[PDB]
Ligand binder design. Sequence first.
Ligand SMILES: [Ca+2]
Ligand SMILES: [Ca+2]
Ligand SMILES: [Ca+2]
Ligand SMILES: [Ca+2]
Lengths: 629, 629
Amino acid sequence: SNFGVDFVIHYKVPAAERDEAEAGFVQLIRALTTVGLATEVRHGENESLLVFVKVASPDLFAKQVYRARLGDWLHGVRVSAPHNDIAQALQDEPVVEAERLRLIYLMITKPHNEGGAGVTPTNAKWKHVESIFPLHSHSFNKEWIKKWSSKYTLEQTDIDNIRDKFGESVAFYFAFLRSYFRFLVIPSAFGFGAWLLLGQFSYLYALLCGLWSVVFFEYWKKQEVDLAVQWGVRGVSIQQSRPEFEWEHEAEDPITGEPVKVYPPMKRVKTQLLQIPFALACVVALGALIVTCNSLEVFINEVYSGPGKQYLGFLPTIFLVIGTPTISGVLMGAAEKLNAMENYATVDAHDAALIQKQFVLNFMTSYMALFFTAFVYIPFGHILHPFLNFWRATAQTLTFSLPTREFQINPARISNQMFYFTVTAQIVNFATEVVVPYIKQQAFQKAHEEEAEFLQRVREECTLEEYDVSGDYREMVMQFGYVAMFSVAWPLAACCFLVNNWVELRSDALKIAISSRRPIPWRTDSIGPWLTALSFLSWLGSITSSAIVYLCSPLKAWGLLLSILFAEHFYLVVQLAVRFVLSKLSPGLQKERKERFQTKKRLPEEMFWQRQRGMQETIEIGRRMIEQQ
Amino acid sequence: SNFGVDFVIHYKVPAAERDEAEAGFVQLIRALTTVGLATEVRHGENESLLVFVKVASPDLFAKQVYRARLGDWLHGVRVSAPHNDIAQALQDEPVVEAERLRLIYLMITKPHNEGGAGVTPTNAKWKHVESIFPLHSHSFNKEWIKKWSSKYTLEQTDIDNIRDKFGESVAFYFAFLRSYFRFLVIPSAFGFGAWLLLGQFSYLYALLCGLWSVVFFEYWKKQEVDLAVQWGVRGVSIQQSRPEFEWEHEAEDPITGEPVKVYPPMKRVKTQLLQIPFALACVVALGALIVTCNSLEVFINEVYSGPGKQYLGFLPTIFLVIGTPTISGVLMGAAEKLNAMENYATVDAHDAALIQKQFVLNFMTSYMALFFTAFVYIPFGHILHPFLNFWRATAQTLTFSLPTREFQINPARISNQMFYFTVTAQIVNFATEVVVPYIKQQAFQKAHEEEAEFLQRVREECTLEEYDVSGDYREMVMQFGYVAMFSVAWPLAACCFLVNNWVELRSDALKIAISSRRPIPWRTDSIGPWLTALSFLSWLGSITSSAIVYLCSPLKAWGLLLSILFAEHFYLVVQLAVRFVLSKLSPGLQKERKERFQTKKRLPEEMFWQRQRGMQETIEIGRRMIEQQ
Ligand SMILES: [Ca+2]
Ligand SMILES: [Ca+2]
Ligand SMILES: [Ca+2]
Ligand SMILES: [Ca+2]
């Protein structure tokens, strides 16, 4: 059990600049004391100095919590008006752990004018402060793992508990994974049905796959809106600006009427418009390598008859493994250099821009081999003839002293590639994610009274790295892209993916439990830029499915064009119909509208009109007029 | 000048059922007296009985106006909170004429439980009440016409005055017409440039026309939102239900917490799903006639050599004129019968459904001849061979006693048709709209003291019909469809349209001034279903332009398919970019958010933490720890 410790600061001290390190330590202690948090100090690993900080006075902390809740309600991020006095607001809803931890973290690091102290390491006057991290709970982790590992389905209460404990981002990711796993069932069902009844490359399968993709996307959007409203986060616009921000001037904010720094959006749009040449450059760089190694593989495997073919067959795999990391790193460095000068105000926008910049690289790294195999190899077996000859010539130049074989296309290559990507890639990915990092950490670790165990545990936790949710989102997005794009060439893929997803729904949890330290609980409204990635992947799959089903079934061009047209237009019509049907039917919006309603409700001219100046006289004159007529 | 009269009721009395008519008259007088409005009675045309009604007590009317304003603010249709007491709300903003007239009309006709009396003629117990209409003002009409006829451009003040006087629907229509006229300038500019420099059937012209169409649509949507917020109408949801409504049960409204009748939306969607067979049936019915008369015209004009060709050349025009009205009437009756059982709650939804049902008929009536000429005649001159032979055979059967000529396609047919539709159709439409109805009314008209002139004027106004804004909207939509669809075949069209639009911007006003009586001032939020019509017309034109430019320039199919693909994808990309750019940049939303913001703001555990219980001691022990290290 934790010893009442709220936050821990590492504060590594190098051997050199000892006076500067001591000055930083005393300044940090002074700042934390003047903020109003109780602090201690203990030993580090070998040169650091671990310190523990916690809240001292519960009453002032409760007052600050109430003020933060009032501000959040005032800014419009929640729909429940708090009580006027602090007598039941903290009793009707207890202060959850995540909210208290987030408030403490915001107190620790913020500008001195409004917050407590700018203890952020990126200030350039606060160095040697390596990281600030909270502490894990062993009993809760064990109970959560045991409960989750022995249940066939997960109700909303588990996701609510995850939101209460670990914040909103992890809960959103787990809810998205649960929804994806639940919606992946129908894919598997009718894919297995088609594989049993029909054959390979079926048009109906592609059409129904597009329909399922659009239906799932719309339903997930609606459920995401509902969940965002339920948890009381909406447009979380209120975040503080990044320290590295450049502004031309300061004006008056039209909403709050406060002086804020203003940067025109036209300059930002003009800077953003330059992304296209970067995309083209990375596209060319990745293609010129992937195609080359793939062609080398086709040469080595297909057209060759010399001994020792098995030994030489591993050349392109190690070539890719050695080569693609450095190209990816150079391109990522260029993308970071580009994004640094974009002048993004909020940190979340900066992270979204970085994710969008990386997405193209991950997309091609995942799909270029399949695209080359399915669009260049199977339909046209003669376009690759000179490239092969090229390689053959080099073989002669390599030999300096060779038999060959007539080239014939093998239709089973795509099935083997899809089977590999569906089974072996998933198995290797799970092994790398779970087993090896724990073994590495344990091997690295192997090589006062009543508190030595706690100190050892906190040191071990400080040794570990920080957990990130971007990787899991990227993996799930790539899996969905595979399903939406290339499932028409091997219908049994989805079923296998389903099984993997189930294991992931627990495996990722284990990754949080033991192999990483608890992240800082942040608040987010949506999953982020992944919605656009999902939409683009679905749209591109809607075309690629029909292109593959026509080009891999003398291949008239007009037939392929007509198939692409029909598939795309059917996808658009289905999307419109699904959107209309869903819009015709959300408790969250109704609740917000009702709350707003309740809040609002809580607060010849004169003589003409004199002739018949009565009731009986008018009726009498009307009767006389009727009788005269 | 009006004699203080607010509203006029006709109350025609037939010769038969005199006792029933008298009973209705006395009941109506009693109801209007018990509501609280001063009423008179005068002579009619020959058997009717005109009555005048006005508000009696200004104080109670002002109180009702304030209550209505408070209710409107409470329901969320306006963003300005009224004053607590009636001392400056009626002084800061004077009660406009349109609002007072609308409130009086709502008082006159409404259910007796909440309103004054159900004087609506569609109640089946209130007959012989032909119509309730307000009175025009001659001085204001003359001044408005004189001011508008002598200004090159119109500022927002004129539209604001129109909104103040004639309500919101007419003001919205005039604002839309002004925006369309202003945005039609660039069309004319580069169309004239292309006609001077390039030749006919240019691809760049079609691409830029699509770009202009999407840009104009997005800008109009933004301006419409801004104008709707400015005038204090938003989601005008608050309208009373139609008397002819069928409900399964009554439940609690989630918003206002009041008992309202509930009809499930799934049944309505299922009923709406049957529209497709009706559309197909009307499509076939219109095509089977238009194609037949067009083919007869081609026979008579092209392949014939007998005398008296000019006399026989007018056969298909009179054939269309005689034939299409009855088909249109039958189809409209069927559509009305279908829409009556749709069970639409609000009257505006019913009108929108009727407009959407009619739109297909007007669309094909306008565009079928051009489609047949541009897609069947010019590219393939041999598909029409047997149809011609068919007609020729009948000629023999007609002769019962003939020379012919070899059939050759004339490329100038499309230019002549477009020139006709651009010049002669507009001239004839303007003449029919303006000149003939006034002459007909004057010819029909030709064949107590100090008030005879007013009685004659009111009788003449009662003679006229009711003004409707649907026709002008339909005409403008069809004009925009022509511009977006078939301008690539004759670039000089847009310029001519521009001139016509200018005249219309005054001509329609004249139509309101003299040829029609003032409509009941209603409130609307948007133009209605015309947004979907504009979007569909633009999307279809984006394809039709490229199809025409490729098929009318040995016509390989793959080239046409590729052209269609490229044009549609370019249109989609341009639409996405324009939407993003516009969203990156609206004062109305900012004002509403600021108003909402202001409204919201108006309201080993114990001993571990004891070892260093201070500030100086912590620093001293930290220094000792550092020294020991
Ligand atoms: Ca995995
Ligand atoms: Ca994962
Ligand atoms: Ca006209
Ligand atoms: Ca008009």
